[PDB]
């Protein structure tokens, strides 16, 4: 059955990217919406929105390419998955591509970036790597 909606979100985004798609339609979740907002703020997706579907809501993510069709996101991976969960302190935050990437971290203050968490001096759960 469905065990990891977040990793499903990441892999649907990745598969749609590698085939050069423009829209991705998803079941709606509050955490998925937060991930999509963090992705949009960092210039990884063109836009994102929410629609009312036949049972629940739905989330539509519009992907972004370059002028000569260069994919904006190069890689997506899930770090803390059901089974083995990953938690990080405020002084051992990870670095993606030596700092050129973004590591989404859920802390008690909300869903932040690794640099945001390092500046605010908090720690939490490392949901994913995007770069």
């Amino acid at each position: 059955t469905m065990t990891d909606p977040i990793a499903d979100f990441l892999t649907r985004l990745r598969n749609a990217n590698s085939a050069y798609h423009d829209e991705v339609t998803l079941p709606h979740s509050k955490l998925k919406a937060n991930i999509a907002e963090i992705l949009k703020r960092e210039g990884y997706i063109s836009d994102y929105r929410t629609e009312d579907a036949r049972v629940g809501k739905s989330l539509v993510v519009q992907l972004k390419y370059g002028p000569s069709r260069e994919r904006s996101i190069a890689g997506l991976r899930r770090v803390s998955k059901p089974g083995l969960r990953v938690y990080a302190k405020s002084t051992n935050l990870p670095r993606v591509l030596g700092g050129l990437g973004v590591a989404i971290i859920s802390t008690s203050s909300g869903l932040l970036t690794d640099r945001q968490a390092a500046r605010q001096g908090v720690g939490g759960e490392v949901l994913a790597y995007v770069w």
Binding site: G83, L84, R85, V86
Partner: protein, 48 residues
Amino acid sequence: GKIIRTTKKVKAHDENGEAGIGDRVSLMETRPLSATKRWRLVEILEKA
């Protein structure tokens, strides 16, 4: 690195025989009352 859930057995003292099997209770650590008995029932918290 996985999170592991494990259980332990504790012998505790209740004077009046109030709490029954299946209840949820609080316990406090005391002096040795007998051979392998070091806890006391402070107050039953949830019935069943």
